[PDB]
């Protein structure tokens, strides 16, 4: 058919009840994730085509980058809690992969300070139980699908995007095929 299980998406054999409608996972250590976000703008283009009433959730993962990877999951929790994802995503990706200036939790904190988050505000969030809970929520969602690779996107706990089955000769066409597939899946 036009959209086929095994081509543009795969189907989870253990569907996850109560999962977010559209769930993206990434790591700031993940090279394809840098491409998805900084070059292809996958999340934004998926969001822009989602049906009314379908919201997007994006979570960081621990399994890349050891200690610093876990610090980045916690910092992503701070970003979600403060609502500053759109201020820190670019400098976190560039700090880890472009300039390689993020080597410690303090260096992560510097990105937030430079982005205008006050030091007391960042530190209060970093140490908060609201943020511990958001870390737990990120870990649980990844565990629910036994996640071992990023980038990854899941729709309604049932379907997983399969970008490896899409033509990569034109970036723009690839992005809208991916977004159109997410829309299709959300309408199933
Ligand atoms: O290599 C793959 C195979 C599957 C799709 C995800 N990626 C990562 C990627 C990174 C940067 C650009 C592109 C791309 C798309 C269309 S033209 C160029 C693709």
GROMACS .gro file of C-alpha atoms and ligand atoms in nm:
model
  207
    1UNK     CA    1   0.000   0.000   0.000
    2UNK     CA    2   0.128   0.361   0.011
    3UNK     CA    3   0.219   0.345   0.380
    4UNK     CA    4   0.337  -0.006   0.464
    5UNK     CA    5   0.439  -0.167   0.790
    6UNK     CA    6   0.813  -0.230   0.753
    7UNK     CA    7   0.868   0.055   0.510
    8UNK     CA    8   0.795   0.402   0.651
    9UNK     CA    9   0.717   0.266   0.997
   10UNK     CA   10   0.724  -0.047   1.205
   11UNK     CA   11   0.466  -0.180   1.451
   12UNK     CA   12   0.552  -0.250   1.816
   13UNK     CA   13   0.482  -0.609   1.917
   14UNK     CA   14   0.425  -0.487   2.274
   15UNK     CA   15   0.205  -0.176   2.237
   16UNK     CA   16   0.233   0.081   2.517
   17UNK     CA   17  -0.099   0.188   2.666
   18UNK     CA   18  -0.129   0.549   2.782
   19UNK     CA   19   0.181   0.658   2.593
   20UNK     CA   20   0.213   1.016   2.464
   21UNK     CA   21   0.052   1.066   2.123
   22UNK     CA   22   0.378   1.153   1.951
   23UNK     CA   23   0.693   1.074   2.138
   24UNK     CA   24   1.042   1.164   2.022
   25UNK     CA   25   1.366   1.050   2.184
   26UNK     CA   26   1.709   1.198   2.134
   27UNK     CA   27   2.052   1.247   2.288
   28UNK     CA   28   2.266   1.557   2.262
   29UNK     CA   29   2.549   1.305   2.193
   30UNK     CA   30   2.370   1.148   1.901
   31UNK     CA   31   2.506   1.254   1.561
   32UNK     CA   32   2.190   1.178   1.365
   33UNK     CA   33   1.995   1.366   1.634
   34UNK     CA   34   2.203   1.676   1.566
   35UNK     CA   35   2.113   1.637   1.200
   36UNK     CA   36   1.743   1.580   1.277
   37UNK     CA   37   1.717   1.887   1.493
   38UNK     CA   38   1.971   2.133   1.362
   39UNK     CA   39   1.973   2.059   0.989
   40UNK     CA   40   1.644   1.877   0.905
   41UNK     CA   41   1.423   2.033   1.179
   42UNK     CA   42   1.226   1.712   1.211
   43UNK     CA   43   1.042   1.793   1.538
   44UNK     CA   44   0.926   2.128   1.415
   45UNK     CA   45   0.807   1.998   1.081
   46UNK     CA   46   0.629   1.703   1.243
   47UNK     CA   47   0.457   1.940   1.491
   48UNK     CA   48   0.346   2.170   1.212
   49UNK     CA   49   0.149   1.892   1.046
   50UNK     CA   50   0.003   1.717   1.350
   51UNK     CA   51  -0.376   1.698   1.361
   52UNK     CA   52  -0.560   1.925   1.600
   53UNK     CA   53  -0.545   1.791   1.954
   54UNK     CA   54  -0.230   1.585   1.902
   55UNK     CA   55   0.061   1.704   2.114
   56UNK     CA   56   0.430   1.625   2.087
   57UNK     CA   57   0.656   1.504   2.362
   58UNK     CA   58   1.037   1.502   2.331
   59UNK     CA   59   1.261   1.324   2.581
   60UNK     CA   60   1.635   1.282   2.627
   61UNK     CA   61   1.801   0.943   2.689
   62UNK     CA   62   2.076   0.819   2.916
   63UNK     CA   63   2.239   0.545   2.714
   64UNK     CA   64   2.487   0.768   2.529
   65UNK     CA   65   2.766   0.961   2.693
   66UNK     CA   66   2.790   0.797   3.032
   67UNK     CA   67   2.779   1.040   3.323
   68UNK     CA   68   2.742   1.348   3.106
   69UNK     CA   69   2.461   1.177   2.916
   70UNK     CA   70   2.270   1.143   3.242
   71UNK     CA   71   2.348   1.502   3.333
   72UNK     CA   72   2.200   1.602   2.996
   73UNK     CA   73   1.879   1.408   3.070
   74UNK     CA   74   1.855   1.602   3.396
   75UNK     CA   75   1.927   1.931   3.214
   76UNK     CA   76   1.656   1.844   2.960
   77UNK     CA   77   1.422   1.798   3.258
   78UNK     CA   78   1.523   2.147   3.374
   79UNK     CA   79   1.455   2.278   3.023
   80UNK     CA   80   1.107   2.118   3.021
   81UNK     CA   81   1.027   2.241   3.370
   82UNK     CA   82   1.131   2.600   3.291
   83UNK     CA   83   0.986   2.588   2.938
   84UNK     CA   84   1.314   2.694   2.775
   85UNK     CA   85   1.363   2.406   2.527
   86UNK     CA   86   1.367   2.649   2.234
   87UNK     CA   87   1.642   2.854   2.400
   88UNK     CA   88   1.884   2.575   2.490
   89UNK     CA   89   1.845   2.301   2.227
   90UNK     CA   90   2.078   2.461   1.972
   91UNK     CA   91   2.355   2.557   2.220
   92UNK     CA   92   2.344   2.218   2.393
   93UNK     CA   93   2.379   2.036   2.059
   94UNK     CA   94   2.653   2.272   1.946
   95UNK     CA   95   2.829   2.259   2.282
   96UNK     CA   96   2.842   1.879   2.276
   97UNK     CA   97   2.909   1.815   1.908
   98UNK     CA   98   3.029   2.129   1.734
   99UNK     CA   99   3.251   2.315   1.975
  100UNK     CA  100   3.287   2.022   2.221
  101UNK     CA  101   3.290   2.273   2.503
  102UNK     CA  102   3.040   2.079   2.717
  103UNK     CA  103   3.244   1.843   2.930
  104UNK     CA  104   3.079   1.875   3.272
  105UNK     CA  105   2.754   1.959   3.444
  106UNK     CA  106   2.892   2.308   3.504
  107UNK     CA  107   2.941   2.348   3.131
  108UNK     CA  108   2.580   2.246   3.072
  109UNK     CA  109   2.473   2.505   3.330
  110UNK     CA  110   2.675   2.773   3.144
  111UNK     CA  111   2.459   2.718   2.835
  112UNK     CA  112   2.148   2.797   3.039
  113UNK     CA  113   2.305   3.102   3.203
  114UNK     CA  114   2.417   3.235   2.863
  115UNK     CA  115   2.064   3.176   2.732
  116UNK     CA  116   1.935   3.405   3.010
  117UNK     CA  117   1.815   3.155   3.269
  118UNK     CA  118   1.918   3.301   3.608
  119UNK     CA  119   2.167   3.097   3.809
  120UNK     CA  120   1.945   3.067   4.117
  121UNK     CA  121   1.654   2.958   3.890
  122UNK     CA  122   1.859   2.692   3.712
  123UNK     CA  123   2.003   2.559   4.039
  124UNK     CA  124   1.663   2.548   4.210
  125UNK     CA  125   1.519   2.355   3.913
  126UNK     CA  126   1.822   2.126   3.888
  127UNK     CA  127   1.785   2.028   4.254
  128UNK     CA  128   1.407   2.002   4.256
  129UNK     CA  129   1.192   1.696   4.295
  130UNK     CA  130   0.977   1.821   4.007
  131UNK     CA  131   1.289   1.775   3.793
  132UNK     CA  132   1.363   1.433   3.951
  133UNK     CA  133   1.011   1.335   3.849
  134UNK     CA  134   1.061   1.460   3.494
  135UNK     CA  135   1.385   1.259   3.477
  136UNK     CA  136   1.185   0.953   3.591
  137UNK     CA  137   0.920   1.021   3.327
  138UNK     CA  138   1.186   1.037   3.051
  139UNK     CA  139   1.341   0.714   3.170
  140UNK     CA  140   1.007   0.534   3.202
  141UNK     CA  141   0.896   0.628   2.852
  142UNK     CA  142   1.222   0.495   2.703
  143UNK     CA  143   1.201   0.180   2.912
  144UNK     CA  144   0.840   0.119   2.799
  145UNK     CA  145   0.974   0.058   2.444
  146UNK     CA  146   1.308  -0.098   2.541
  147UNK     CA  147   1.481   0.190   2.365
  148UNK     CA  148   1.838   0.133   2.249
  149UNK     CA  149   1.874   0.373   1.960
  150UNK     CA  150   1.811   0.738   1.877
  151UNK     CA  151   1.677   0.933   1.712
  152UNK     CA  152   1.344   0.757   1.754
  153UNK     CA  153   0.982   0.859   1.719
  154UNK     CA  154   0.674   0.665   1.834
  155UNK     CA  155   0.308   0.730   1.763
  156UNK     CA  156   0.040   0.631   2.018
  157UNK     CA  157   0.256   0.367   2.179
  158UNK     CA  158   0.203   0.153   1.871
  159UNK     CA  159   0.414   0.262   1.581
  160UNK     CA  160   0.779   0.353   1.532
  161UNK     CA  161   0.906   0.576   1.253
  162UNK     CA  162   1.142   0.409   1.009
  163UNK     CA  163   1.341   0.682   0.829
  164UNK     CA  164   1.588   0.427   0.689
  165UNK     CA  165   1.314   0.340   0.441
  166UNK     CA  166   1.300   0.691   0.295
  167UNK     CA  167   1.496   0.851   0.007
  168UNK     CA  168   1.769   1.079   0.139
  169UNK     CA  169   1.868   1.260  -0.178
  170UNK     CA  170   1.664   1.569  -0.092
  171UNK     CA  171   1.647   1.693   0.268
  172UNK     CA  172   1.320   1.885   0.225
  173UNK     CA  173   1.141   1.587   0.068
  174UNK     CA  174   1.268   1.356   0.338
  175UNK     CA  175   1.144   1.583   0.616
  176UNK     CA  176   0.794   1.615   0.472
  177UNK     CA  177   0.773   1.242   0.405
  178UNK     CA  178   0.863   1.184   0.770
  179UNK     CA  179   0.610   1.446   0.887
  180UNK     CA  180   0.338   1.311   0.655
  181UNK     CA  181   0.400   0.961   0.792
  182UNK     CA  182   0.365   1.084   1.150
  183UNK     CA  183   0.035   1.251   1.051
  184UNK     CA  184  -0.085   0.931   0.881
  185UNK     CA  185   0.004   0.724   1.186
  186UNK     CA  186  -0.162   0.964   1.427
  187UNK     CA  187  -0.482   0.930   1.223
  188UNK     CA  188  -0.484   0.547   1.235
  189LIG     O1  189   2.124   0.893   0.708
  189LIG     C1  190   2.010   0.879   0.735
  189LIG     C2  191   1.934   0.763   0.669
  189LIG     C3  192   1.791   0.767   0.720
  189LIG     C4  193   1.742   0.908   0.746
  189LIG     C5  194   1.810   0.962   0.871
  189LIG     N1  195   1.950   0.972   0.831
  189LIG     C6  196   2.029   1.078   0.890
  189LIG     C7  197   2.042   1.198   0.796
  189LIG     C8  198   2.134   1.312   0.839
  189LIG     C9  199   2.150   1.419   0.764
  189LIG    C10  200   2.076   1.429   0.633
  189LIG    C11  201   1.997   1.331   0.595
  189LIG    C12  202   1.930   1.352   0.462
  189LIG    C13  203   1.791   1.328   0.435
  189LIG    C14  204   1.757   1.358   0.301
  189LIG     S1  205   1.895   1.422   0.212
  189LIG    C15  206   2.001   1.404   0.352
  189LIG    C16  207   1.977   1.206   0.681
   0.00000   0.00000   0.00000
